[PDB]
């Protein structure tokens, strides 16, 4: 019932409900004539709505921000990014043009300045160290160490036991190495490690490009970032 590519029209978002208060967003975009979906996250805060990253470019940001008020009807009022990439910033800009508080890791708003990307308006602090935690209302944001980026951070739901690893952590179906430009391959075995070691309760994995499963999704991601380190 996950919402796949073929369901989703070219600047269409797709929001799944994960669990109570919990919502993934999917959107797509091509990449060298090839086309991709992409996860985000929605939680609620109250009477508010908490937006984990942007829906991938502006245009599918504001599908975005138009089916959460068509469909959930409450106010996105703080946005975070995960890491400094185009499918987790891009779109700020139509974030903050509405009126929601975008939120990174002062890690992530470098990064994402020397890229010459978007920028979240507000810095996350206590977040520089592997293996920092600090709570963002519903969510607790962890940063497990470097992995696919060196700012990666991963959000877990605790009243719903979902854990979002983002583009740290693949699908299942995914059984080679996506973009490791920007990863650190040394590391992200250990920061998957880190993860692990803090959620093992987590019912509910969203990768950031894909299906949804469970922890498996942990030990998958490292045995592909291990093959793909030992590449010959
Ligand atoms: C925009 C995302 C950020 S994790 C990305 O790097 N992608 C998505 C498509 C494949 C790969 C690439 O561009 O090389
Ligand atoms: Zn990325
Ligand atoms: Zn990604
Ligand atoms: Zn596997």
Redesign the pocket.
């Given at each position: 019932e996950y919402p796949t590519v073929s369901e989703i029209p070219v600047g269409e978002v797709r929001l799944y409900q994960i669990a109570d208060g919990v919502w993934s967003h999917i959107a797509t975009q091509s990449?060298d004539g090839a086309v991709?979906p992409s996860n985000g996250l929605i939680v609620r805060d109250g009477d508010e709505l908490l937006l984990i990253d942007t829906a991938?470019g502006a245009k599918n940001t504001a599908a975005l921000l138009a089916e959460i008020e068509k469909q959930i009807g409450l106010p996105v009022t703080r946005a975070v990014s995960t890491h400094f990439?185009?499918?987790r910033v891009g779109g700020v800009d139509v974030l903050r043009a509405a009126g929601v508080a975008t939120y990174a890791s002062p890690s992530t708003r470098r990064l994402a300045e020397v890229e010459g990307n978007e920028i979240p308006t507000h810095s996350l602090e206590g977040l520089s160290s592997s293996g920092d935690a600090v709570r963002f209302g519903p969510v607790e944001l962890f940063y497990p160490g470097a992995a696919?980026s060196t700012d990666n951070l991963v959000v877990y739901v605790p009243s719903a036991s979902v854990l979002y690893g983002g583009?740290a952590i693949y699908e299942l179906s995914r059984t080679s190495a996506?973009?490791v430009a920007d990863a650190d391959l040394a590391e992200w075995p250990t920061s998957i490690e880190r993860i692990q070691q803090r959620y093992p309760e987590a019912q509910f994995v969203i990768p950031?490009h894909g299906l949804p499963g469970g922890l498996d999704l942990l030990k998958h991601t490292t045995n592909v970032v291990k093959a793909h380190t030992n590449r010959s």
């Open positions: 990449f991709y991938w990439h185009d499918d696919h583009c996506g973009n950031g």
